[PDB]
């Protein structure tokens, strides 16, 4: 497995990265993101399967919470999402 | 079915709305949101099942794309998420 | 400078590689190929500038001949093309 | 202006046609081709200027895309190249 972490960069960067893997010998790709990037992650998944690679399906979606390393004596919780796209 | 639409209001407003339904005779509740609110929707689901109602499970997650009403002659696409929480 | 060598793989692999660089901090990208791959190289350049990134211009095109390492006692000549795409 | 269209015939046919024009009162000759013939076009230009007429220079190279007449209800796009050779 191939993983694409979605951050704050333009959505197209992650769409290409995703398409690249699918075109480079990957039958499945997992899109991951945390916090506010979660919205972008879903956009990536939608753009890929809607206008670049119809046929690709959403195999599974998982949400969770990650406890980040403490800062100034407090460990903050952030939401995470994982979206598995399949050929 | 009970639905809670997540917008830009504080996360706690949606957590309470969600908890309210679960405490008011609902065995399941669907959290929905579009665009950037998707991130908040996941936060709501996590807060509810993590610190307010452990035991509640994530029954299903669905993502899609909604074509919004045209504005200035252009119909924009926005991502959507639906999270079903179950007792 | 960023270089993308075009071979026999599907054209889309090279289009994405090209788009990736342009989206990853490159103001210019050089597409190169030899022999029969030259045709594909031009396709890549056209696809990129026509349907994925209008605005990108063809800065320069250079053709030449490369003498390949000898095989069975004969050094064969192959044609090459270099296409510079600019933002 | 004199134009030599490069197709699927042996490369030598196009080299001679090109040399013929240059030897028949032409100071410049344009080699054109589309699709996979583009590779052959470059070979023609290289053979002419490398072993038959050193001194002849590559004046300009232009690539583009031509929309072909529709077939079965679909207009296909094909790449094209134009190579101007000058005395």
Swiss-Prot record, chains A, B, C, D:
<dbReference type="GO" id="GO:0005737">
    <property type="term" value="C:cytoplasm"/>
</dbReference>
<dbReference type="GO" id="GO:0003723">
    <property type="term" value="F:RNA binding"/>
</dbReference>
<keyword id="KW-0158">Chromosome</keyword>
<dbReference type="InterPro" id="IPR002775">
    <property type="entry name" value="DNA/RNA-bd_Alba-like"/>
</dbReference>
<dbReference type="GO" id="GO:0003690">
    <property type="term" value="F:double-stranded DNA binding"/>
</dbReference>
<dbReference type="InterPro" id="IPR036882">
    <property type="entry name" value="Alba-like_dom_sf"/>
</dbReference>
<dbReference type="GO" id="GO:0030261">
    <property type="term" value="P:chromosome condensation"/>
</dbReference>
<keyword id="KW-0963">Cytoplasm</keyword>
<comment type="function">
    <text>Binds double-stranded DNA tightly but without sequence specificity. Involved in DNA compaction.</text>
</comment>
<keyword id="KW-0226">DNA condensation</keyword>
<dbReference type="GO" id="GO:0005694">
    <property type="term" value="C:chromosome"/>
</dbReference>
<comment type="similarity">
    <text>Belongs to the histone-like Alba family.</text>
</comment>
<keyword id="KW-0238">DNA-binding</keyword>
<dbReference type="InterPro" id="IPR013795">
    <property type="entry name" value="DNA/RNA-bd_Alba"/>
</dbReference>
<comment type="subunit">
    <text>Forms homodimers and homotetramers. Interacts with Alba 1.</text>
</comment>
<dbReference type="Pfam" id="PF01918">
    <property type="entry name" value="Alba"/>
</dbReference>
<protein>
    <recommendedName>
        <fullName>DNA/RNA-binding protein Alba 2</fullName>
    </recommendedName>
</protein>
């Amino acid at each position: 497995e191939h993983v694409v972490y979605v951050g704050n960069k333009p959505v197209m960067n992650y769409v290409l990265a995703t398409l690249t893997q699918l075109n480079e010998g990957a039958d499945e790709v997992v899109i991951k993101a945390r916090g506010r990037a979660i919205s972008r992650a879903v956009d990536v998944a939608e753009i890929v399967r809607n206008r670049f690679m119809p046929g690709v399906k959403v195999k599974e979606i998982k949400i969770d919470t990650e406890e980040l390393e403490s800062e100034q004596g407090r460990r903050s919780n952030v939401s995470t999402i994982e979206i598995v796209l399949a050929k």
